[PDB]
RNA sequence: UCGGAGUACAAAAAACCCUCCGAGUGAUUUUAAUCUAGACAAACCAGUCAAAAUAAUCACUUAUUGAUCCAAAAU
């Protein structure tokens, strides 16, 4: 992390967080599963689909992941057509 | 002896199906397998 | 009074007034289906999930708009939701909307409707779900089979 | 009123010399000095920590960084040119409509959804304009011309049940800016620029009067239109007998930011007059 | 049996149907751990995108 | 690095330049599919079961294996 920039002063944000990863407004992150075009052959098809999954990232490792990103990545998005945003927002959590 | 990777072509359109071959030859490669376009059951030949 | 090269006059040169667009044609669709000034439309609006029922309602009887032929095949094929008083009742659930839920009544209407005056259509019947009942439908048909003429 | 006042007659006068900020307001800052935060001051003993340099953020101790182990994805890709339209719900619609921010009579475009502080556009973060979705589709009760860049079937059909007309038009990112806060650019003090034609892709959308896109050709108008009804079963109003229908019928070209203005244009606010070229290439220039 | 409720008892038809309790779904989690994407829909209230403010 | 037994006598866990056995794959035919409740396990990463919904066996069987990135391939 460059927590001051040289040229802007500002907070500069790690890329290569964002390439492998998804933001939601709700904060959830979201990822793929490690090695899932790797050795197909070599797997039980249950592990394929458990691979082939997407999935949710524990309260550390977001919480991590939002330090390395800064306010850009972390505002409300509408675009047209997008297959997750049916998923941004939370509902009826009771904590 | 040998393990040999080989992929398997479906007769209609795209669908493939990958696996491996023994190198000794005891039965060798063609299949009855699942096809996702169609829905179906068909011959997948041993291709590469 | 802009125009440009670009506008829709210019590309569309048949129709051009301001009025154009917004003729009504009543002669393209003269048939009507489903004259929605004869239905009693009513609404059960629940909230809490939140789902407004629609419900669509018309004598059987009383509907001049489907001829003779459609208006009693409709009272065989759907006489399972028929009410007492004549009326035929058509139910929708899912969207909160109402809107969605007219279309959808209205849809499962002009699906009935569409159904019923096809006289080409066969009610092919599936043996999975009724097996059971075909060979309970024999079985019992073996002792009703015994012969004594009574009373 | 606030009979606070009367126990201020009793007290001695508010100066300089007696203020106290809102309890809370100063949580204190401390500092590692004495016997409680000297020594070591919160930094724990020896080791790196004590030291100040422990390792970057990303950093597992060497074991492969969680967010490095995981494989990239298609996911923020091309995350920049993904257009974004902001929603408005027919809800909001209703309600500024309600408390007169802004009224129906007039037409209304994206402008005037923003002068009312209805609908906030950032141009610049790939915004391509306002879309319409159906939330208050029961409530809405008001007749109305809206523009808007794209708008659900729905919505359409809650509009025309009350006898609006709306019609889907498309702006482009410096146009739209243009639209958004115009009066910025006019003290910006240029022509004001053609319109641009939406890209390639878009070209189908707005083509249909399936959306009533502006580029549609109005002939299919009238029909796509009374279709909307069947589908959602009402009695569609003629809109050509009304007394606000001049107002209705009220479009753009393709070419044009506003109503009433055209592309070559020069506003001088001071003035409070309007300037147009006389000269004949810059009229085929702005006209085409 | 239609017959019978309009003509004999003077009453309307009463129909019934099978209902099998709603499925169980543990105490949501804020965070939920290495859980398939779908996890959300599965305490999803109801089907509808729901813009509150917009 | 991986797995079986003891050490660890009865849910789990549990070290040692501790004691003893193994694995870095064969053999076939029956090619072992999509999709999803609920779970085990677990610092993380990986690992395991699995109803309803649509159309793999035998060798003590448990081990037979490597993440990103990067390359080559086509759908
Ligand atoms: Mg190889
Ligand atoms: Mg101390
Ligand atoms: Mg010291
Ligand atoms: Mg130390
Ligand atoms: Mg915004
Ligand atoms: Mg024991
Ligand atoms: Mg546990
Ligand atoms: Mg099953």
């Known amino acids: 992390v460059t927590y001051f920039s040289s040229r802007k002063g500002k907070r500069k944000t790690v890329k290569a967080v964002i390439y492998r990863f998804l933001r939601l407004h709700s904060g959830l992150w979201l990822r793929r599963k490690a090695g899932y075009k790797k050795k197909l052959w070599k797997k039980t098809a249950a592990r394929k689909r458990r691979l082939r999954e997407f999935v949710f990232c524990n309260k550390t490792q977001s919480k991590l992941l939002d330090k390395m990103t800064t306010s850009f990545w972390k505002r409300r998005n509408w675009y047209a057509d997008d297959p997750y945003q049916k998923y941004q927002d939370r509902t009826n959590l009771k904590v | 002896s040998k393990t040999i990777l080989v992929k398997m072509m479906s007769q209609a359109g795209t669908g493939f199906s990958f696996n491996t071959k023994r190198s000794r030859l005891r039965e060798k490669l063609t299949l009855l397998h699942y096809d996702p376009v169609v829905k179906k059951k068909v011959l997948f030949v041993e291709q590469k | ?151 | ?288 | 049996v239609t017959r019978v409720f309009h003509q004999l008892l003077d009453m309307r038809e009463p129909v019934f149907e099978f209902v099998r309790p709603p499925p169980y779904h543990p105490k949501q989690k804020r965070f939920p751990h290495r859980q398939p994407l779908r996890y959300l829909d599965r305490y999803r209230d109801s089907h509808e995108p729901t813009y509150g403010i917009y």
């Open chain 3, 1 to 151: 009074e802009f125009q440009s090269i670009y506008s829709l006059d210019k590309l569309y040169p048949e129709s051009r007034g301001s009025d154009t667009a917004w003729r009504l044609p009543d002669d393209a669709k003269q048939a009507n289906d489903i004259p929605v000034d004869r239905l009693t439309i009513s609404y059960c609006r629940s909230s809490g999930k939140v789902n407004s029922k629609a419900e669509v309602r018309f004598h059987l009887a009383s509907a001049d708009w489907i001829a003779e032929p459609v208006r009693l095949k409709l009272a065989v094929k759907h006489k399972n939701r028929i009410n007492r008083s004549g009326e035929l009742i058509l139910t929708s659930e899912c969207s909160r909307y109402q809107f969605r839920n007219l279309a959808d009544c209205l849809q499962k209407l002009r699906d009935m409707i569409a159904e019923a005056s096809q006289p080409x259509x066969x009610x092919x019947x599936x043996x999975x779900x009724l097996r059971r009942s075909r060979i309970e439908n024999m079985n019992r048909e073996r002792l009703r089979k015994k012969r004594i003429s009574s009373a």
């Open chain 4, 1 to 288: 009123g606030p009979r606070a006042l009367d126990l201020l007659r009793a007290l001695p006068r508010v100066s300089l010399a007696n203020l106290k900020p809102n309890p809370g307001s100063r949580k204190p800052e401390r500092r590692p000095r004495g016997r409680r935060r000297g020594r070591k001051c919160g930094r724990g003993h020896k080791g790196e920590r004590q030291r100040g340099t422990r390792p970057r953020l990303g950093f597992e101790g060497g074991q492969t960084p969680f967010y490095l182990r995981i494989p990239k994805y298609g996911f923020n890709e091309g995350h920049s040119f993904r257009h974004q339209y902001q929603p408005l719900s027919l809800n909001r619609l209703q309600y500024l409509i309600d408390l007169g921010r802004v009224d129906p009579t007039q037409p209304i475009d994206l402008t005037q959804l923003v002068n009312g502080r209805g609908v906030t556009i950032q141009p610049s973060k790939r915004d391509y304009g306002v879309q319409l979705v159906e939330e208050g589709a029961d409530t809405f009760k008001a007749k109305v011309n809206i523009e808007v860049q794209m708008a659900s079937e729905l919505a359409i059909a809650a509009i025309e049940k009350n006898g609006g007309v709306v019609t889907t038009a498309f702006y482009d990112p410096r146009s739209l800016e243009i639209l958004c806060k115009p009066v910025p650019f006019f003290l910006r003090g240029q022509p004001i620029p053609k319109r641009m034609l939406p890209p390639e892709a878009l070209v189908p959308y707005y083509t249909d009067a399936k959306n009533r896109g502006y580029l549609a050709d109005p002939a299919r108008f009238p029909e796509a239109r009374l279709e909307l009804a069947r589908k959602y079963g009402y009695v569609l109003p003629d809109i050509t007998k009304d007394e606000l229908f001049k107002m209705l019928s009220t479009r753009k070209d393709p070419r044009q930011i506003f109503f009433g203005l055209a592309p070559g244009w020069v506003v001088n606010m001071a003035d409070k007059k309007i300037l147009k070229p006389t000269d004949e290439n810059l009229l085929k220039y702005y006209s085409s």
